[PDB]
């Protein structure tokens, strides 16, 4: 149950640069750079549900830690990958050559995606039940 909670974005580094490189239609790139998105995570042991909302674009995802699962990326592209726990508080996966780390520390979820040399980094905070 550790990741569960509702979280809102506070600040991000390199949003625009990273969203370009991944075939994000520019309309969303500009409308998106400023949205403090909300993440809903529901964890039950290995099983994860998470929903990322950024006004009207709702991406909902589910995975089992350790299993190969379909994930829906930024662009809407669905990609087969495995998500891994590396300790109770850290989700690590790799898709379309992006290395993604999600990390809980207290009420703070830090997510970091790197495409070759670009480090897109989102920091979020818990907002209630
Ligand atoms: C203006 C209305 C539509 C809103 C469009 C928002 C598009 C957002 C684009 C990228 C946001 C997704 C963030 C990645 C998810 C994550 O960090 O795990
Ligand atoms: C749309 C991006 C795809 C998501 C691929 C990462 C899968 C595991 C990590 C997601 C768990 C919830 C963390 C989101 C927190 C945040 O928005 O920064």
Curated annotation (Swiss-Prot):
* Listed GO CC annotations: cytosol; extracellular exosome; nucleoplasm; nucleus; peroxisomal matrix
SUPFAM superfamilies for the chain = Lipocalins
Residue positions, PTM Phosphoserine: 11, 39, 56, 100
Q: What is its main location?
A: cytoplasm
Return the CDD domains for the record: FABP1
Whether Transport counts among this entry's keywords is yes
Provide the protein's localization. Cytoplasm
Q: Which residues carry this modification: N6-succinyllysine?
A: 31, 36, 46, 57, 78, 90, 121
Task: Give the top-rank taxon of the lineage listed in the UniProt record for this protein.
Answer: Eukaryota
Gene Ontology BP, a term: cellular response to hydrogen peroxide
Q: What's a Gene Ontology MF term here?
A: fatty acid binding
**PROSITE patterns, alphabetized:** FABP (PS00214)
Residues that bear Phosphothreonine: 51
InterPro entries in the cross-refs:
Calycin (IPR012674), Fatty_acid-bd (IPR000463), ILBP (IPR031259)
Q: Read off the Gene3D superfamilies from this record.
A: 2.40.128.20
Q: What are the alphabetically sorted keywords of the record?
A: Acetylation, Cytoplasm, Lipid-binding, Phosphoprotein, Transport
Checking Pfam families in the record gives: Lipocalin_7
Q: What is known of its domains?
A: Forms a beta-barrel structure that accommodates hydrophobic ligands in its interior.
Q: What does this protein do?
A: Plays a role in lipoprotein-mediated cholesterol uptake in hepatocytes. Binds cholesterol. Binds free fatty acids and their coenzyme A derivatives, bilirubin, and some other small molecules in the cytoplasm. May be involved in intracellular lipid transport.
Homology family: Belongs to the calycin superfamily. Fatty-acid binding protein (FABP) family.
Protein name in UniProt = Fatty acid-binding protein, liver
Q: Which organism is it from?
A: Homo sapiens
Gene label? FABP1
